[PDB]
Amino acid sequence: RQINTEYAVSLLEQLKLFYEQQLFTDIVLIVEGTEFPCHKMVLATCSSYFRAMFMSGLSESKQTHVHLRNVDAATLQIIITYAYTGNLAMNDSTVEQLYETACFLQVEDVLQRCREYLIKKINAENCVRLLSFADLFSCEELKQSAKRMVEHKFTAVYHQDAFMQLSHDLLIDILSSDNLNVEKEETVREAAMLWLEYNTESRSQYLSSVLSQIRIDALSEVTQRAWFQGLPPNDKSVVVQGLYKDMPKFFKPRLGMTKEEMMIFIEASSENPCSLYSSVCYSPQAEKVYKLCSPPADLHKVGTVVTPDNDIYIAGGQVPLKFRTVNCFYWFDAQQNTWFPKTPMLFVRIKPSLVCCEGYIYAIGGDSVGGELNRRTVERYDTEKDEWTMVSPLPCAWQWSAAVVVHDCIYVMTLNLMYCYFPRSDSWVEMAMRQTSRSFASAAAFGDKIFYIGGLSVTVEIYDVNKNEWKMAANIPAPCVRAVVISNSLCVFMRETAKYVTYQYDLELDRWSLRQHISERVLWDLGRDFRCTVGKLYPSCLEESPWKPPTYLFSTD
Amino acid sequence: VVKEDNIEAVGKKLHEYNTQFQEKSREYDRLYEEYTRTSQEIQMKRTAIEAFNETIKIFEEQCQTQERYSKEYIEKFKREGNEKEIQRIMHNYDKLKSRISEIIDSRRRLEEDLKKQAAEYREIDKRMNSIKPDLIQLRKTRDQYLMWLTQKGVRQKKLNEWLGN
Amino acid sequence: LMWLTQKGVRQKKLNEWLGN
């Protein structure tokens, strides 16, 4: 019928065998003294540059020796190896030079592969360098991705040396963007100052363009501090999602002045049957719920973890049988409301205990008991390296266990025992046991004390990290509880099968005070298996969908 | 019941009244949801317009603070024959006036949005005021028929099937 | 019924309670 694949792979392997023994070599490429015999047809079919050079009919198609300059020998070898096979060795050490050589040779396949690899490899350490690279080589997709990454973590990357060596257009397009994740304009002002003072003799003429991009007369959230905070309870968030929108974009409050602390509920049951495992985030300050497009592959049984840098991650879980367990790792883009996948895990897990410790995210347990040494395995992920490293596994196989982090130390709790992990020692130490044997309990690290609340019957058990002793505090004022720390205060979001209400606990007085009721106006039944956490998100452009009539039960009579 | 006694025909009427009543309850709770969304809308728009007002007030405070600077520390920035040093309040003045103009235009935009949403809300608020007497009248007629036509050989399951279509 | 029944009671247990 058409091109047969069975002969195609045989012809390709025969061409490779002929190239290895140097048969029918008609062209000789000279790169910085090194010689490479090759065929003109393969280079023409793979690279359009060689195609145009050979189809011109000039001496280049007649002379056997062609001198190629400004081309690395290793990159040319990788291009030619790929030209005779199809496997691309893309590593983080030589990806930029490979992309440069490909764009100089115009290999569409290699160009696209290197582009997508660089896009899936943008971290918080190379974002600025990759942005400069994309600007120099005019790659719009990589440029936009790196710009978004810089806008997401500007306050963390504006100290790097790559930021002070940026061009003028990059500076004026980064500073003018309203997506700068900064809590104060003073940070952007000091960034511009250090950029202009890095090289004064060449940037003394750009001081006007520098000062014209920093908002000085904005006065975003200081004007509210001048008059008063007099409003309905914590209605400063309404001004955030109101004044910001309607703004000439010159005095606009930057995106960093818009993030609000919201209770992130994932796998929260939804009235809509299609998405019975949806995810919504109720803002305690704005008193409003915001819809999330959280499920990237309509799956569930995934854990939640919020780093101190306010980053959301989900891992583990299983997709419906097209319920096969998977390894995908998803990071949430708080600006685009879309999860970008990462390097999959090494072992499949179901609701893994994900906690952030010393910049690493650890996957603890969260899987059905299979194999003595095969289970209880613990694995951590490197953020910048995008890799998974195995660590000392769990001492014993547990179920429905929780994990917290205090003082850069890992803690996992079980029925009545407790083990503390130290990354510096990579070992497990059994700690003070608990007087009660309970399951399905929720735990949240607050200050120097770990709170263990649950049991499936509620009892507030306080552990001291400094004393290694467990002391009883009280009971949850009531049961489906979710202990979460918000507003620098320990709280418990309890669901009374459904009624919703949040309580505040006093550590000194050992008393639980009513903090705020969550009227059934919105926040419908979220089920019982939903995972909860605390994080700051931009309500400005997250999602807007009430979905719930705040009034019902007509009283006309 | 239009003086009828076919029983089966009287029951068919009961089903027509069923339709009328059901359609109303749906539009009734729909108008209630519209009332609630319009209520929260004007609340969000009033928390926005008072924010606009207080921002205009603090911007006028900055405008008079410029006049205060014209006597506080302007002595060492105008008599030296330089214009780049004074841009910190002089180039921050004309653009502040333009900001005042554009936020006044934005306030006018919010005001016309307020009046247009109030118009589109009152054009149906009057419908609520007129549909409720007719609704309660239809419900009273249904309750009166439920005290006579229903006792002529119809079952409660039949009434549920009639009101469920 | 909305509260205590959904802890760990059986409908059959409720019938036996209401049948005495």
CSV table of C-alpha atoms in Angstrom, one decimal, chain A residues 211-526:
chain,number,residue,atom,x,y,z
A,211,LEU,CA,12.2,54.3,36.6
A,212,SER,CA,9.3,54.4,34.1
A,213,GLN,CA,8.5,50.8,34.7
A,214,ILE,CA,8.5,50.6,38.5
A,215,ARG,CA,5.1,51.7,40.0
A,216,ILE,CA,5.8,54.4,42.5
A,217,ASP,CA,2.4,56.2,42.8
A,218,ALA,CA,0.5,52.8,43.0
A,219,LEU,CA,-0.1,52.7,46.7
A,220,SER,CA,-1.9,49.4,46.4
A,221,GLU,CA,-2.4,48.1,49.9
A,222,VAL,CA,-1.0,50.9,52.0
A,223,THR,CA,-4.0,53.2,51.4
A,224,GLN,CA,-6.2,50.7,53.2
A,225,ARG,CA,-3.7,50.8,56.1
A,226,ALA,CA,-4.0,54.6,56.2
A,227,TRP,CA,-7.8,55.1,56.5
A,228,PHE,CA,-8.8,52.0,58.5
A,229,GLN,CA,-9.6,48.3,58.3
A,230,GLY,CA,-13.3,49.1,58.9
A,231,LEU,CA,-15.3,46.7,56.8
A,232,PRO,CA,-17.3,43.5,57.1
A,233,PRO,CA,-15.1,40.8,58.6
A,234,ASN,CA,-11.8,40.8,56.7
A,235,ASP,CA,-13.2,42.4,53.6
A,236,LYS,CA,-9.8,43.6,52.5
A,237,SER,CA,-9.8,40.6,50.2
A,238,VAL,CA,-13.0,42.0,48.4
A,239,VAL,CA,-11.0,45.2,47.6
A,240,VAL,CA,-8.2,42.9,46.3
A,241,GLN,CA,-10.6,41.1,43.9
A,242,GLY,CA,-12.3,44.5,43.0
A,243,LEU,CA,-9.9,47.5,42.7
A,244,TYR,CA,-7.1,45.3,41.0
A,245,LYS,CA,-9.4,44.3,38.0
A,246,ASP,CA,-10.4,47.9,37.2
A,247,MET,CA,-7.0,49.6,36.9
A,248,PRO,CA,-5.1,51.4,34.0
A,249,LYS,CA,-2.3,48.7,34.5
A,250,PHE,CA,0.2,51.4,35.4
A,251,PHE,CA,-0.8,51.7,39.1
A,252,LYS,CA,-2.0,48.0,39.1
A,253,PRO,CA,-1.2,46.1,42.3
A,254,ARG,CA,1.2,43.3,41.2
A,255,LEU,CA,0.0,39.7,41.3
A,256,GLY,CA,2.0,39.1,44.5
A,257,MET,CA,-0.1,41.7,46.2
A,258,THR,CA,-3.2,39.6,45.4
A,259,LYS,CA,-2.4,36.1,46.9
A,260,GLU,CA,-4.8,35.2,49.7
A,261,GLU,CA,-4.6,32.3,52.2
A,262,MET,CA,-7.3,29.8,51.3
A,263,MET,CA,-8.2,26.4,52.6
A,264,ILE,CA,-7.3,24.0,49.7
A,265,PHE,CA,-9.7,21.1,49.5
A,266,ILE,CA,-8.8,18.4,47.0
A,267,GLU,CA,-10.9,15.3,46.2
A,268,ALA,CA,-13.8,17.2,47.8
A,269,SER,CA,-17.0,15.4,46.7
A,270,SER,CA,-19.1,17.6,44.3
A,271,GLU,CA,-22.9,17.6,43.7
A,272,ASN,CA,-22.1,17.3,40.0
A,273,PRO,CA,-22.0,13.4,39.5
A,274,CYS,CA,-19.4,13.6,36.6
A,275,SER,CA,-16.7,15.1,38.9
A,276,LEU,CA,-17.6,13.2,42.2
A,277,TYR,CA,-13.9,13.9,43.2
A,278,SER,CA,-13.7,17.7,42.6
A,279,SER,CA,-11.5,20.2,44.3
A,280,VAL,CA,-12.5,23.7,45.6
A,281,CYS,CA,-10.7,26.2,47.9
A,282,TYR,CA,-12.8,28.2,50.5
A,283,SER,CA,-11.3,31.6,51.4
A,284,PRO,CA,-11.8,32.3,55.2
A,285,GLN,CA,-10.9,36.0,54.6
A,286,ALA,CA,-13.0,36.6,51.4
A,287,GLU,CA,-15.7,34.2,52.7
A,288,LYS,CA,-16.0,32.9,49.1
A,289,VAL,CA,-15.3,29.5,47.5
A,290,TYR,CA,-13.3,29.3,44.2
A,291,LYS,CA,-13.5,26.5,41.6
A,292,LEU,CA,-10.3,24.7,40.7
A,293,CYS,CA,-9.5,22.7,37.5
A,294,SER,CA,-7.3,20.5,39.8
A,295,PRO,CA,-7.8,17.1,38.2
A,296,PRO,CA,-5.3,16.9,35.3
A,297,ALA,CA,-6.2,13.3,34.4
A,298,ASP,CA,-9.6,12.8,36.2
A,299,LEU,CA,-7.9,10.7,38.9
A,300,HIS,CA,-8.0,10.6,42.7
A,301,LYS,CA,-6.3,9.1,45.8
A,302,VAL,CA,-3.5,11.7,45.5
A,303,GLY,CA,-1.9,13.4,48.5
A,304,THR,CA,-1.4,17.1,49.1
A,305,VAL,CA,1.7,19.1,50.3
A,306,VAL,CA,2.3,22.8,50.7
A,307,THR,CA,5.9,23.9,51.0
A,308,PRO,CA,6.7,27.0,53.1
A,309,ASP,CA,7.3,28.7,49.7
A,310,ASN,CA,3.5,28.2,49.0
A,311,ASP,CA,3.8,25.5,46.4
A,312,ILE,CA,1.2,22.8,45.8
A,313,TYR,CA,1.9,19.3,44.6
A,314,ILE,CA,-0.1,16.1,44.1
A,315,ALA,CA,1.4,12.6,43.6
A,316,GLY,CA,0.4,8.9,43.7
A,317,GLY,CA,-3.1,7.9,43.2
A,318,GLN,CA,-4.7,5.8,40.4
A,319,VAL,CA,-6.6,6.6,37.2
A,320,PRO,CA,-9.8,4.6,36.3
A,321,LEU,CA,-9.2,1.4,34.3
A,322,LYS,CA,-9.4,2.4,30.7
A,323,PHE,CA,-8.0,1.5,38.5
A,324,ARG,CA,-4.4,1.3,37.4
A,325,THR,CA,-2.0,2.9,39.8
A,326,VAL,CA,0.4,5.5,38.3
A,327,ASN,CA,3.5,7.6,39.3
A,328,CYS,CA,2.7,11.1,37.8
A,329,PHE,CA,3.8,14.1,39.8
A,330,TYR,CA,1.8,17.3,39.2
A,331,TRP,CA,2.7,20.9,40.3
A,332,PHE,CA,0.0,23.5,40.3
A,333,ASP,CA,0.4,26.8,38.4
A,334,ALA,CA,-1.3,29.3,40.7
A,335,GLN,CA,-1.5,31.8,37.8
A,336,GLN,CA,-2.8,29.6,35.0
A,337,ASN,CA,-4.9,27.2,37.1
A,338,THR,CA,-3.3,24.2,35.3
A,339,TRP,CA,-1.1,21.4,36.6
A,340,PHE,CA,2.2,20.7,34.8
A,341,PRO,CA,3.4,17.1,35.1
A,342,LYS,CA,6.9,16.3,36.4
A,343,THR,CA,9.2,13.3,36.6
A,344,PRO,CA,7.0,10.3,37.6
A,345,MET,CA,7.7,8.5,40.9
A,346,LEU,CA,9.7,5.3,41.1
A,347,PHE,CA,7.0,3.3,42.9
A,348,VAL,CA,3.2,3.7,42.5
A,349,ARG,CA,1.4,4.9,45.6
A,350,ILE,CA,-2.1,5.6,46.9
A,351,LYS,CA,-2.5,8.7,49.0
A,352,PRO,CA,1.2,9.0,49.9
A,353,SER,CA,2.1,11.1,52.9
A,354,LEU,CA,3.8,14.0,51.1
A,355,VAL,CA,5.7,16.5,53.3
A,356,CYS,CA,8.3,19.1,52.6
A,357,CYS,CA,11.6,18.9,54.5
A,358,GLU,CA,14.8,20.8,53.8
A,359,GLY,CA,13.5,21.7,50.3
A,360,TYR,CA,12.8,18.0,49.5
A,361,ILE,CA,9.3,16.5,49.1
A,362,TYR,CA,9.2,13.0,50.7
A,363,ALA,CA,6.7,10.3,49.7
A,364,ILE,CA,6.0,8.2,52.8
A,365,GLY,CA,4.0,5.0,52.6
A,366,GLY,CA,0.6,5.4,51.0
A,367,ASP,CA,0.2,2.0,49.3
A,368,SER,CA,-1.3,-1.4,49.8
A,369,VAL,CA,0.9,-3.9,51.7
A,370,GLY,CA,2.8,-5.9,49.1
A,371,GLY,CA,6.1,-7.5,50.0
A,372,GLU,CA,8.0,-7.1,53.3
A,373,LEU,CA,10.9,-5.1,51.9
A,374,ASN,CA,8.9,-4.1,48.8
A,375,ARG,CA,6.5,-2.0,50.9
A,376,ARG,CA,7.3,0.6,53.6
A,377,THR,CA,9.5,2.2,51.1
A,378,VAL,CA,10.2,5.9,51.3
A,379,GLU,CA,11.3,8.1,48.3
A,380,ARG,CA,12.1,11.8,48.0
A,381,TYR,CA,12.1,14.1,44.9
A,382,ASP,CA,14.7,16.7,44.1
A,383,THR,CA,13.0,19.9,42.8
A,384,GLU,CA,15.8,21.4,40.6
A,385,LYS,CA,17.2,18.0,39.6
A,386,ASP,CA,13.7,16.6,38.8
A,387,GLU,CA,14.7,13.1,40.1
A,388,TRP,CA,13.7,10.6,42.8
A,389,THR,CA,16.0,9.2,45.4
A,390,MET,CA,15.3,6.2,47.6
A,391,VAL,CA,15.9,6.6,51.4
A,392,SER,CA,15.7,4.5,54.5
A,393,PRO,CA,12.3,2.7,54.3
A,394,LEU,CA,9.6,2.7,57.0
A,395,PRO,CA,10.4,0.3,59.9
A,396,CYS,CA,6.9,-1.3,59.9
A,397,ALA,CA,4.0,-1.4,57.6
A,398,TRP,CA,1.3,1.0,58.7
A,399,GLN,CA,-2.1,2.2,57.4
A,400,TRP,CA,-3.8,5.6,57.4
A,401,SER,CA,-0.7,7.2,58.9
A,402,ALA,CA,0.0,10.9,58.9
A,403,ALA,CA,3.2,12.9,58.4
A,404,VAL,CA,4.4,16.3,59.5
A,405,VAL,CA,7.7,18.2,59.6
A,406,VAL,CA,9.0,20.2,62.5
A,407,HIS,CA,12.5,21.9,62.7
A,408,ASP,CA,13.5,20.2,59.4
A,409,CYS,CA,12.8,16.8,60.8
A,410,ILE,CA,10.4,14.2,59.4
A,411,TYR,CA,7.7,12.6,61.7
A,412,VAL,CA,5.3,9.8,60.9
A,413,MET,CA,2.7,8.6,63.4
A,414,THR,CA,0.6,5.4,63.6
A,415,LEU,CA,-1.8,3.6,65.9
A,416,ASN,CA,0.2,4.0,69.1
A,417,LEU,CA,3.8,4.3,68.0
A,418,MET,CA,5.8,7.1,66.5
A,419,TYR,CA,9.1,7.2,64.4
A,420,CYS,CA,11.2,10.3,63.8
A,421,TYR,CA,13.4,10.4,60.7
A,422,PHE,CA,16.5,12.5,60.3
A,423,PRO,CA,17.7,13.3,56.7
A,424,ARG,CA,21.2,14.1,58.1
A,425,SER,CA,21.4,10.6,59.5
A,426,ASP,CA,19.0,8.8,57.2
A,427,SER,CA,17.7,6.5,60.0
A,428,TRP,CA,14.5,5.8,61.9
A,429,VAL,CA,14.1,6.4,65.6
A,430,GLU,CA,11.2,5.2,67.6
A,431,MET,CA,9.8,8.0,69.8
A,432,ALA,CA,7.4,8.4,72.7
A,433,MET,CA,4.4,6.1,72.2
A,434,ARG,CA,0.8,7.4,72.4
A,435,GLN,CA,-1.6,6.2,75.1
A,436,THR,CA,-4.4,5.6,72.6
A,437,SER,CA,-4.5,3.4,69.5
A,438,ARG,CA,-6.4,5.2,66.7
A,439,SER,CA,-6.6,5.4,62.9
A,440,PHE,CA,-7.6,7.8,60.2
A,441,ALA,CA,-6.4,10.7,62.4
A,442,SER,CA,-5.3,14.1,61.0
A,443,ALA,CA,-2.1,15.8,62.0
A,444,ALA,CA,-0.7,19.3,61.5
A,445,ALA,CA,2.6,20.9,62.7
A,446,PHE,CA,2.1,24.1,64.6
A,447,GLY,CA,5.1,25.7,66.2
A,448,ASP,CA,7.1,23.3,68.3
A,449,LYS,CA,4.2,21.0,68.9
A,450,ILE,CA,2.7,18.2,66.8
A,451,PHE,CA,-1.1,17.8,67.2
A,452,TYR,CA,-2.6,14.3,66.6
A,453,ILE,CA,-6.4,14.7,66.2
A,454,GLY,CA,-8.8,11.9,65.0
A,455,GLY,CA,-9.4,8.3,65.7
A,456,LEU,CA,-12.7,7.3,64.0
A,457,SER,CA,-14.5,9.8,69.3
A,458,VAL,CA,-12.1,12.8,69.1
A,459,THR,CA,-9.2,13.6,71.4
A,460,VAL,CA,-6.7,16.4,71.1
A,461,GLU,CA,-3.2,14.9,71.8
A,462,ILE,CA,-0.3,17.3,72.0
A,463,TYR,CA,3.3,16.1,71.5
A,464,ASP,CA,6.3,18.2,72.5
A,465,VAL,CA,9.3,18.0,70.1
A,466,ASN,CA,11.6,19.5,72.8
A,467,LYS,CA,10.3,17.3,75.6
A,468,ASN,CA,9.5,14.1,73.6
A,469,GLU,CA,6.3,13.8,75.8
A,470,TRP,CA,2.6,13.5,75.0
A,471,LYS,CA,0.2,15.5,76.9
A,472,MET,CA,-3.6,15.6,76.7
A,473,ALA,CA,-5.3,18.9,75.8
A,474,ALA,CA,-9.1,18.5,75.2
A,475,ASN,CA,-11.6,17.2,72.6
A,476,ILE,CA,-12.8,18.7,69.3
A,477,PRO,CA,-15.9,20.8,70.0
A,478,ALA,CA,-18.5,18.6,68.4
A,479,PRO,CA,-17.3,13.6,63.4
A,480,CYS,CA,-15.1,14.5,60.4
A,481,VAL,CA,-12.2,16.8,61.4
A,482,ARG,CA,-9.4,18.4,59.4
A,483,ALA,CA,-6.7,20.0,61.5
A,484,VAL,CA,-5.0,22.8,59.5
A,485,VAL,CA,-2.8,25.8,60.6
A,486,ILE,CA,-3.9,29.1,59.1
A,487,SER,CA,-3.4,32.8,60.1
A,488,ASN,CA,-0.4,31.6,62.2
A,489,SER,CA,-2.9,29.7,64.4
A,490,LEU,CA,-3.9,26.1,64.8
A,491,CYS,CA,-7.4,25.3,63.5
A,492,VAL,CA,-9.6,22.3,62.9
A,493,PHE,CA,-12.1,22.3,60.0
A,494,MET,CA,-14.8,19.9,61.3
A,495,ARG,CA,-17.7,18.5,59.2
A,496,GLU,CA,-20.7,17.5,61.4
A,497,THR,CA,-22.7,15.0,59.3
A,498,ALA,CA,-23.5,18.2,56.8
A,499,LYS,CA,-22.5,21.2,58.8
A,500,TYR,CA,-19.3,23.1,58.4
A,501,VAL,CA,-17.6,25.3,61.0
A,502,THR,CA,-14.0,26.3,61.9
A,503,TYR,CA,-12.7,26.5,65.5
A,504,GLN,CA,-9.7,28.2,67.0
A,505,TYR,CA,-7.5,26.6,69.7
A,506,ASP,CA,-5.7,28.4,72.5
A,507,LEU,CA,-2.4,26.7,73.2
A,508,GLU,CA,-1.8,28.5,76.5
A,509,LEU,CA,-5.3,28.3,78.0
A,510,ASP,CA,-5.9,24.8,76.5
A,511,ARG,CA,-9.3,25.9,75.2
A,512,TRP,CA,-11.1,25.7,71.9
A,513,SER,CA,-12.8,28.9,70.8
A,514,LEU,CA,-15.3,29.3,68.0
A,515,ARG,CA,-13.6,31.1,65.2
A,516,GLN,CA,-16.0,31.3,62.2
A,517,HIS,CA,-19.1,29.5,61.0
A,518,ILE,CA,-19.2,28.4,57.4
A,519,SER,CA,-22.9,28.9,56.4
A,520,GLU,CA,-24.4,26.3,54.0
A,521,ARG,CA,-24.9,29.3,51.6
A,522,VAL,CA,-22.0,27.7,49.6
A,523,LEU,CA,-19.4,25.0,50.7
A,524,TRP,CA,-21.7,22.0,50.0
A,525,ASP,CA,-21.1,18.4,51.2
A,526,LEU,CA,-17.4,17.7,50.5
